[PDB]
Design an enzyme around this catalytic site. Sequence first.
Site: not given
Ligand SMILES: *Cc1c(COP(=O)(O)O)cnc(C)c1O
Ligand SMILES: *Cc1c(COP(=O)(O)O)cnc(C)c1O
Lengths: 380, 380, 380, 380
Positions: B45, B97, B169, B194
Amino acid sequence: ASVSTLLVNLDNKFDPFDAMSTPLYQTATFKQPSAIENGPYDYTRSGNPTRDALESLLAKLDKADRAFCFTSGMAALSAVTHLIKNGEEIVAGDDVYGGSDRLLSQVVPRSGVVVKRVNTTKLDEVAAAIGPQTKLVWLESPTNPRQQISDIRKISEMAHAQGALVLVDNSIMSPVLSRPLELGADIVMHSATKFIAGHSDVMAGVLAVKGEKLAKEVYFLQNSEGSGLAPFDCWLCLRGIKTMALRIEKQQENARKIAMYLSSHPRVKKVYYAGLPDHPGHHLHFSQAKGAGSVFSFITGSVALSKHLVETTKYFSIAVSFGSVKSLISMPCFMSHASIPAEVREARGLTEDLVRISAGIEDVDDLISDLDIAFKTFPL
Amino acid sequence: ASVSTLLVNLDNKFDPFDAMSTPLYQTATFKQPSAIENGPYDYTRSGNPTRDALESLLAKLDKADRAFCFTSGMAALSAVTHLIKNGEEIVAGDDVYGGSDRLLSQVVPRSGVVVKRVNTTKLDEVAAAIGPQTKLVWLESPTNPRQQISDIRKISEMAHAQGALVLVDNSIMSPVLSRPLELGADIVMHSATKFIAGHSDVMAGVLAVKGEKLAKEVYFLQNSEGSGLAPFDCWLCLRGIKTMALRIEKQQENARKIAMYLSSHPRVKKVYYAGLPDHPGHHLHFSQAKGAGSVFSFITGSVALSKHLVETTKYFSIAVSFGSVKSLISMPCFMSHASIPAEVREARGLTEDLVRISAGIEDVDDLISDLDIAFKTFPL
Amino acid sequence: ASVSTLLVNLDNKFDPFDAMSTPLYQTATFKQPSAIENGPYDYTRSGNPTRDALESLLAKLDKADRAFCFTSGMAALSAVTHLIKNGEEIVAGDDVYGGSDRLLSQVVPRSGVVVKRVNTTKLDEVAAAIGPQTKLVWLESPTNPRQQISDIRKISEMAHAQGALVLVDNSIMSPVLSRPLELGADIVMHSATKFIAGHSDVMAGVLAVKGEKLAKEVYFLQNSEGSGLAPFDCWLCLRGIKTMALRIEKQQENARKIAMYLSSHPRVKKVYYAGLPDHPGHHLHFSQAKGAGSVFSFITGSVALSKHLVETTKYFSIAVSFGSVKSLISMPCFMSHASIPAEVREARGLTEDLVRISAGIEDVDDLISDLDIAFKTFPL
Amino acid sequence: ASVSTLLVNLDNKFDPFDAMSTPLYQTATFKQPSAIENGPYDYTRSGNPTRDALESLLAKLDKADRAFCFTSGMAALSAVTHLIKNGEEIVAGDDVYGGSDRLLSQVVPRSGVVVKRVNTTKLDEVAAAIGPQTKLVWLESPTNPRQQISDIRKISEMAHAQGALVLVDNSIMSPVLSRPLELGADIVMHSATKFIAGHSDVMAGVLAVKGEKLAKEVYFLQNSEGSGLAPFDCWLCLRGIKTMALRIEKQQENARKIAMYLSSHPRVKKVYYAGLPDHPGHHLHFSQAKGAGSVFSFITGSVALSKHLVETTKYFSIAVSFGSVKSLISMPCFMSHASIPAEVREARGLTEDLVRISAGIEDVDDLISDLDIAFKTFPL
Ligand SMILES: *Cc1c(COP(=O)(O)O)cnc(C)c1O
Ligand SMILES: *Cc1c(COP(=O)(O)O)cnc(C)c1O
Ligand SMILES: *Cc1c(COP(=O)(O)O)cnc(C)c1O
Ligand SMILES: *Cc1c(COP(=O)(O)O)cnc(C)c1O
């Protein structure tokens, strides 16, 4: 029908060939049937057959109305957080996890939401903390690394008393040991990166919801802020959840035995573990859970001895999190907060020498033996 | 060093074995080197080698300081959004969008952030709308599906003279036809779902940032809201991005030719494509983009004939989005807003018979012949 | 219906949700419908939906009755080989690729199968070598790395008049430049690791068969020797094969131009490329292939200058194989047979200074400029 | 250091970032360091870091000199088979598995190798079967579905007495219960599709070898017939092997209890399971293994009752193979040979009504209860 038996069932109705493993829909779009109407699926951010198979097993596991899968645990908690509007309040147990901390502190505020902190173990403290405009009560139990217990049924009624939602972050227990929705919580969150996937090779977060209007509002945010767990990660989660009962069963027992060996060890000053008969909270915990878990910690009053145990052991890996088949060992006190000074660690109930262990599924004699040799090699 | 050429460059300093493909780090945690210090990595992460390889290529393509990959396009737009605090101001085009629309009208408000909607093609309005509270200007050019051109150099100067961030965007253009950070924009965003990935099989969003402070602020959110694109997904983006220049080259040319054919066709009333000399904005757009891309639409004045072209074409799939190797066709009015009434459908600059096509990499003679037949088989 | 156009056709009758990407069936077993009867599927070694989707596309591209996908190119050549019984005869060119060579001299013998090696460009030899015991004729044109052209229509008639099967390893040509089953061949084989997958990231072999009996015999071996390509691999082939026509188009043109440049270059003695008018075989090859592909080589009479071009070029990777989007460069004599002596290195038609290039899809001006500099920096 | 503890260790030296999961090298080629020399890796068919991590854990597990991974179990056995030349002989236990059967019968012959069949339980039979020119002795034990035991130490000396290799197909036991190399075998084969991966979602085969010259000859065939397990499949194998001890431990115990419940059931005529004290071979087995396994079968003299159990049970899936976390049930007698007539099944020790079970990791009370209800619902 036991959990063990439920974790391995394949209820994939949609699959014409009945494969033993769930088919992976690694696609972004689906073709529509006509110019005017959609099909069951259209875009993966909205819904996907593989994620649906996982979100659906997880609802059954938690006895929830609907379950949601997020790219990570934090994403799940962040979405929950986007449910409280401007001028509302959040009563956050002040013990709650690092990323949860950072979130409640540095992010939730930019949204005009108020953040109260407490010790969910003191009902009065939480009693006084629940205001008029309190919309979310957010708990963790056992806490970490101390394993302090909070009463989820009662904190549920106080909160429900103000028309507030109770969030229970069950990550440390998993659906096999606890099911908070049956204790009054509204939303249970699980970092699936831990026990659910159990192999430390996939990030995922899970929200299990009680109540349809509620679920509809989570789906709105999973589908609009686009944080739905990816198809491949869902598949790895599906593959891992299958041995969850088997893995927790061995892990927890390893933890019991290592907690007991450490409990009576000359160089160990204290051992935190809700499974120990002597644990403040023991009986309280088991009134709302079937097990202590496989994570525990201990103190040695000696930071130089603690580093040594951490860095000397041959069977424990120095790493964060828990719930993997590999046993982990760390010092959350001088590590899971390396930016923690002498007052930055004192301002957080923990002590520079504290060692936390996440027991894996190895032979417990290998692990206890490894720890013993480690104490016997520390020079003076 | 050309883009076609940069796209296949494998820059993996970390890999000991110089694989031709970047090693996929499908793991959630990494082992720390000692009890006190961390390693280059610790938690997916927070960061991952595979995602780093992609975020780096993407920063080079966009001439950005740093780039970030999110679980999806919307997740990325949602983070940019979490940069703006309680009670600040957001000026964003009207065209913007669907998912961005929803995010702008139903989620951003929950933070006390105020949103003004403008027709970014009319500098006055832009001027009129940008006050002392404006912290974000959010453009999109060409607009969908009309392909309206806004002046990005001039909008950037206004906002900057007001101390506001400018987001563009650039999903429909991608890095090989436009690089907005060289036109005043502060953050460029792409739905990597895309053109970047290019195969309709991965969901991903990208954020290309200008400015160390800003970047730090974007990283802080990608990390805390746990939304960085997953490693398998990053690997699929790395894989598909390599043919990006190649895919667009044949795709763009295809769209040119297909607009040619439709423009002079008896049953087609208006054709929207910025590559057509007759298109309002042509000279503006090409003054800030090296090409008109591959999406365009046309009106036929006949909702019945449009559905017919859409459902009868043998070589176009009825589907949402664009930028994939497969040619798609759809109707944004009666589909990408299907559940839209009579004035609720015209409450968006788009007559219900507007047909949008996304050219893919097939033989343009196959595609043009496919459309001709469909025009000829339509019942009267 | 053009090839570029056929390659993106998604023909998945089985999939209920019409995903744009073929669902990956990553599973080893399938549930049977009753105790007595089986289902369409039962075991991935026997068959899998994902592999079927690819084997089908591949049969259509090659105008074959049925196609089969193997774990790798060699596995496929190895199965064709397990078609020939104890004490039968195999006539195979001298040129034939390294791994095929090894397989022909050290493994085929173990079965009592006899192998004769011929220079397939000289019909007499072919004639002379084909007796009553010949059950397999194994060609390869162009040859590597000289690019020698053999007449496939005439070799097929001879063998057939002797009742022998004809195999053509069409790896260097792929389905969009040659389709040997329309020239007398019985089985065409491809190292799908090369142009089909096209990204240097998947190992795969393909067998395209003419004749139901033959096919049945190939299937019997793909199934019993458990060697069908795995599902993830089939999925990656399906994904990469979509840009095949596109990749070759820009690649071939690149090779043309780069041979142009080298042909008239002062430090280059001979250039081997079948696209060059001056190349022996040009008219033969183009009489049976729509193009000269993208691999070619040249001699410089200087082993020292060849190594230098190879190691100094900034845009070519030193690597084995071809057909990938990345340009590669190597020396078949001092490398693809590195551990080769003085006469053991010349015991193969290739002077130790021969350099082979596989053009990729980068800017040809970048590649040609990259080579020029390398010719200029070479020390005297 | 226990197996349990060994299965979860990550000894990936090559990895600069110490990820908890083994990095997946999904590539075909690697770049070479210079024009004249290779790197550790060059082409995946030859070697790959991920497969090396798996082949290497498996050598330790079996106490072998070297281990090899194949695209499937049959591929592993087919390679073994390509070790005996023309005019050699193979003494094959005649009980041996279906695909092994088909192989020894229909394929091994085309190579001028002779095939003797026997009852490896009768030392005289096998004594008389071991000729002068006998180069391979191929065993299985327990057999399937009968669980008949063969003495591997003695059959090892008879064979070694003629300078022959002993192959022991351990698939049904896995390295956690048996290690044949320590009983005189030369090569142990495991269909890793079974217990090793344990999730029925990956085909793989494993050859574990004793003796360096021997291993060099297997590597020759894995590397020349190109049947090395793919990187992704290796990774799934690595992920699954980790809970192998945990899964076999529960599975085997479920099997013991269901064998005991069936053993004393009124409608069950016989129960085959080496763990039952009453099993002919019991003591013999445990002199060379630590457990009976989790696969067993039984007879009911009633084909109509057997189909019913198979098709009525709600917790058993009707499928082939065994060793998955899901319990399986079948009739190898009228199914794993549907093409088996009334004499085709009699010519193979088994009986139309025989039911085979592969116990999974569910709650054994769920499974026994499921089977009981099933007997009590069969009408007369
Ligand atoms: C498709 C689209 C998005 C959304 O993106 P996701 O990958 O589907 O979440 C954002 N901006 C534009 C301009 C798009 O055409
Ligand atoms: C490990 C832990 C998280 C973190 O989650 P991620 O999936 O790695 O972002 C959240 N809450 C508790 C209670 C944890 O102990
Ligand atoms: C590369 C090559 C092969 C080998 O194929 P693999 O996929 O690497 O096993 C076979 N034939 C030719 C002509 C080749 O160039
Ligand atoms: C299941 C089985 C095999 C088959 O292996 P595959 O990996 O599926 O090809 C081989 N041997 C034995 C002994 C088995 O029981």
